[PDB]
Structure 1
Amino acid sequence: SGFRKMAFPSGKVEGCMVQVTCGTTTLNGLWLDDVVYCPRHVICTSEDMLNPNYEDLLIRKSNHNFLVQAGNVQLRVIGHSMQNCVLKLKVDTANPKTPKYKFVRIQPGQTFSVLACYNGSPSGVYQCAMRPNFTIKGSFLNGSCGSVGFNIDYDCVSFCYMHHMELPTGVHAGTDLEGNFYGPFVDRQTAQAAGTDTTITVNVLAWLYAAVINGDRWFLNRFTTTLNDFNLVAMKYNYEPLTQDHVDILGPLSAQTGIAVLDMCASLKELLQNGMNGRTILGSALLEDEFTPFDVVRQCSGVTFQ
């Protein structure tokens, strides 16, 4: 029993964090095999924050303009290249702690663990979701650029996020490990406001299924809804549309609890209408939207508390 924001165990990723210095700037890199990945903005000065030309800034650098430190050991840089918004530094030593890994680009609503690091040293681990407006609501201070997000299903690390910047509204923007930004964001300090964010409806449904698996039903009702009528209502509360793909994804949680997906949708419509009347659901007084269907199946029992 219980239900917590649950991160993956971080050790496989801790063994990959290094410090990258270019000029007066130090940030984090990811050391996998003989490559160190980091944000390309490490090569920007005071004067390069609005309209950097990264090709022009990089051609000016030699291998020895990059310092990579792994614990107390300097790694020698023997090559460099830029892929989209990531710098790749080839080093003379392969990381002996490199885990089984892959790079994945995720979609809005997907979750991952963030290993927040400073000076190449891990500070803490927490869960995040890719918001519908392609930001993350992280917890990051100066020095955390290059911290990464990942999942570790099936003993393979799936890296999905590298942290680049905090936007003026205090949310966070970054790239996949091929250096493509999530969303319309660019590595410039020009205005680029996040879209108004919305609630990840499929994840709220998943979390209501978790609440039923863990033993609570108070919020259910005798109604159903069509998918169209559900979306017409949910949109009035700035919830994302629920697609037939989302309904399919919820199938297993529906089968485990005996609650049809459109019947759980009718419960959510009534919670949006009514509130909780002083009750909580899994310890929350607000509807939670950063647990995916897959996350619920990862953490909850396979046997409902009936």
Structure 2
Amino acid sequence: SGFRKMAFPSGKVEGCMVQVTCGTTTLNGLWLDDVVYCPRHVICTSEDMFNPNYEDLLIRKSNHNFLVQAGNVQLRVIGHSMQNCVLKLKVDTANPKTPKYKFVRIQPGQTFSVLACYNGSPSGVYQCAMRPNFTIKGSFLNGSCGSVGFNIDYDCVSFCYMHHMELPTGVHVGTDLEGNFYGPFVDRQTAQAAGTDTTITVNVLAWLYAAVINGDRWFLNRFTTTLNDFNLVAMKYNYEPLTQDHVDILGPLSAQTGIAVLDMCASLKELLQNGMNGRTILGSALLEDEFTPFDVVRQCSGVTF
């Protein structure tokens, strides 16, 4: 037993990380088959980031201006193209460590692991959620751009995120692997600010199920509620409205524990209205929202890859 914020094993992604240098800018790239994906702002200095015209800046870049290094060995760039906000650098060697993979555009509220990297080298791994305002709360220093987020199902890596920017608020924005930003954000150093950081209600409920499975039960009460009544409280607390689809998604956890979904909603309603009274749940003094219902089942049943 025990429940921890757990990232996927990162070995399959470590083997895909490269360093991409263009002029004086170095960030990370993702090498899959004979293509390296990286943020298009690798072509920019920090001064260019205030109002870049990427098509114009790219005119002055040729294949040989993109230096790509896998460990200590140089790859040969034989073509390049801009797709949305990423560059695709065609190299002459397919990555021998390419895993089975897919590119997926995740929905807000879903979770993924991030392999934070610098100069093409892995630093660490941690689990994130795509927030309802389309930011993530990561750990990214200068040079971490191009680090990726992913999920693994058995032997297949589903890449869902590439890091591009930090906002002045200290939160993080980026694209899918087709280069389309999550949310309204752009790869320019501007006044762009995140909206309300709403709480992912279905995930909180999943984590309360995880708590019950792992022995934390003090918050179970004698009440029930309805979706409409619960949502009147969710709105007050800046929680996402809970839908019938969410109830359905909690079905397996409800069956495993014998606690009806709406009974758990009534427990959450009380926790929102009365606080935790100095108590903890699964070692946390706040209501955790970065575990999906699938994450909870995965960890509680020991799924491997």
8 Å Cα contact 2:154/2:304 also seen in 1: no
Deviation digits for residues 98-153 of structure 1, max 9, x if unmatched? 00000000011101000000000000000100011000000011110000000112
Deviations 1:265-305 (A, max 9, x none): 01000011122223211111111100000000001149999
Query: Unaligned stretches of 5+ in structure 1?
Result: none
**TM-score normalised to the size of structure 1?**
0.97
Deviations 1:166-203 (CA, angstroms, capped at 9, x unpaired): 00000000000000000000011111100021111100
Q: What's the CA shift for 1:215?
A: 2.0
In the other structure, the counterpart of 2:260 is 260
Give 1:216 shift. Answer: 2.6
Cα separation, partners in 2 of 1:259 and 1:53, compared to 1, 3 Å: same
Asked if 1 retains the 8 angstrom alpha-carbon contact of 2:163 and 2:172, the reply is yes
Partner secondary structure for residue 231 of structure 1: helix
- Which one is further off, 44-53 or 214-223? 44-53
CA deviation vs aligned residue, 1:15-49 (integer Å, no higher than 9, x gap): 00000011110000000000000000011134421
Percent of residue pairs bearing the same amino acid type = 99
Cα offset for 1:81? 0.3
When residues 46 and 221 of structure 1 are mapped into structure 2, their CA distance, relative to the original with a 3 A threshold, is closer
| Aligned equivalents of 1:213, 1:30: Cα separation in 2 | 38
State the Cα deviation string for residues 52-71 of structure 1 (Å, max 9, x = none): 11111112211111100000
Q: For the residues of structure 2 that align with 1:139 and 1:303, how far apart are their CA atoms?
A: 27
How far apart are residue 97 of structure 1 and its match? Answer: 0.3
SS class of match (1:101):
strand
The aligned residue for residue 300 of structure 1 is 300
SS at 1:218 equivalent: coil
Name the SS for the 1:58 alignment partner: helix
- Report SS of the residue matched to 1:82: strand
SS at match of 1:221: coil
CA contact (8 A) 1:115 1:147 kept: yes
Partner secondary structure for residue 49 of structure 1: helix
SS of the aligned residue for 1:113 comes to strand
Contact kept, 8 Å, 2:112 with 2:151, in 1: the verdict is yes
Distance 1:107 1:115, change over 3 A: same
Give 1:158 shift: 0.5
CA RMSD, Structure 1 to Structure 2 (Å): 2.2
Q: Which one is further off, 295-304 or 261-270? A: 295-304
Q: Which residue of 2 aligns with 1:2?
A: 2
Q: Deviations over 1:227-266 (max 9, x none)?
A: 0110111110111111111111101001111111111101
Change (3 A) 1:67 1:212: same
Are 1:33 and 1:95, in contact at CA under 8 Å, matched by a contact in 2? yes
Partner of 1:160: 160
Does residue 38 of the first structure (1) align with residue 41 of the second (2)? Answer: no
Give yes or no for contact 2:30–2:146 (8 Å, CA) kept in 1. Answer: yes
Separation in 1 of the partners of 2:166 and 2:39? 13
Question: Distance between the aligned counterparts of 2:156 and 2:303, measured in 1?
Answer: 27
Structure 1 residues 36 and 196, CA, compared in 2 at 3 Å: closer, same or farther?
same
Once residues 301 and 177 of structure 1 are traced to their aligned partners in structure 2, the CA distance between those partners, rounded to angstroms, is 30
Deviations 1:64-84 (A, max 9, x none): 111000001010100000110
For the 8 Å contact 1:163–1:174, the answer to whether it is kept is: yes
Greater shift, 92-101 or 53-62, is seen at: 53-62
Distance 2:40 2:80 in 1: 11
Change (3 A) 1:303 1:158: closer
Deviates more, 1:212-221 or 1:76-85: 212-221
Note the C-alpha offset of 1:154: 1.9
Answer whether contact 1:212 1:304 (CA < 8 A) is retained: no
